[model samples]
Target: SMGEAPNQALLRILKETEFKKIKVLGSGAFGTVYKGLWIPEGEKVKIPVAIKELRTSPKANKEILDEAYVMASVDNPHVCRLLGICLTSTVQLIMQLMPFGCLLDYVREHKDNIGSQYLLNWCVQIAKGMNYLEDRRLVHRDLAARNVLVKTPQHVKITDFGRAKLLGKVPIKWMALESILHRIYTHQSDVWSYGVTVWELMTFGSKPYDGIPASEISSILEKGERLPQPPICTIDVYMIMVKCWMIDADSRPKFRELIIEFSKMARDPQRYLVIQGDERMHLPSPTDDMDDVVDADEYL
Candidate 1:
């Protein structure tokens, strides 16, 4: 009984004919997401869904399979849920529709009404999801603000698990230094992206490392330039961001350690964060604090 498919719904290869693709939800270098609905043979009501149509590549049949494996292996409220996999004209992944839309748009549109409490809440959500992934030993090479979906203002889910990086396209802004220079990828690199993603949340989804010439990115990084602290972000939060962008990837904090710290900060915001309302404040860096970083065993 333990051996049978627990999430068989995720493993199903449903017929394309039973599904109806509605309006386009999003399209980028990765793929196109459409509002869709599926009706099984006997079901009277149509099930609402979001269908992602990736490329019809001669090479990416494996790519599509890889994405399916990652999604099926993970089932988290903070992570997107895949309903079924289908391919007719192109490989398609049917997922539960996120009605509130992406975190990028949500933050940008409502930045005026939002504040640090809301931003910190969303940041911890993503961190919790990543901690789950690190426990599972999976790396999301393309983690960013756009990849995060908002189900509600206070709730978000991580979507698009590197399904669109078809060799030619790469996410440079959120990439780790060694990833850009040596093409080396690891769990550590994902930590780097999470750092940038947190930075995006801090800045209310402003573009990371904006206005830099693309051709000079490697040179700029080689010079050890990191994204500056958000004006309103406290040193407590910015320090965590700094640890993520460390030139030495080995020293970057694990997602579990991040959970302990962020949870503490969010729970007692005043103790760690002093920036209140619209005013900006800066605290000294914690580089030499030399406090023992807690081990993952605490919550694992």
Candidate 2:
């Protein structure tokens, strides 16, 4: 009774479309998502699908169609692909269904550091996915944990391209891609959002600012105030985040660079991380040694 769908809308959606063919996956800003299956007879295989029902405004409806177009053009393991489309009265975007759901779920269940080895592995995957999108001249305007879906215990896929825009096609101000002072959205803006998304996964889904209002965050980011780096973030991650947030858009590292750096760390996590002299991680500064330091004479 609590989480069950109301009978009326459910029946309507079921009778009118392919949603009935799909098992419920989850929900999003666009609408309820489903996992569809194709089982053919005579030694045939079953195809898995992720189906998203279009439920946004008229404008977003177009964006949804555009997203499908974008995914259809690219194919990469790290990125989600658009499988098919059912353009009825209600838009039914059929996609490859991911088995595991979002990366945020995994991070939360494990408290972020699923061991350095695992973390590095996933981070590299994220970079690869971002690189793929960038190379295609696509920008994922809203790169966040909610937009990333994992299909397995170790495999990740970047999903939700509804906000994605082609480099030269979309108007910047409309999507809020510009700086607060400018309001222009660009490929570089996606980099900034990706940095924040990395923080989300690294912190086990910790919010960008705990209880801070959106307006406050806008102010902080616009003015170049540094965000608090959680202690769990390794040096490599911290550095990458810094590169993503460079005040100048051009200064942000291209997703290609991010892919290479992440791949290196994934191959040998321990090599990129410093285990000793990590006190700077928790302490912002070192106070005078007089409180706990022994006299130089004592050492002699």
The digit string of per-residue lDDT tens for model 2 on 90-135 reads: 6777777777678787678755236555566677677778777876
lDDT of 2 at 199: 76
Candidate 1 on 1-300: residue-level lDDT in tens? 675344443487889888898899888766778998899887787888888876367676677777776776678778887787886768788888887788888778766666666677677788888777766666788999988997767688888875422227688888888999899888788889999998887777899768875667778888988888887678889999999888898899988778777766665555454444532422122342324444454355
The local distance difference test score of each candidate is 0.76, 0.66
lDDT of 2 at 127: 72
Q: TM-scores of all models?
A: 0.82, 0.75
TM-score of 2: 0.75
- Clashing pairs in model 1, backbone N/Cα/C closer than 3 A: none
Model 1, residue 174: C-alpha shift (Å): 0.9
lDDT of 2: 0.66
Q: Which residue pairs of candidate 2 clash?
A: 177-184, 177-185, 178-183, 178-184, 178-185
Off by over 4 Å in 2: 1-22, 40-43, 55-61, 168-177, 271-300
Point to the candidate with the largest TM-score: 1
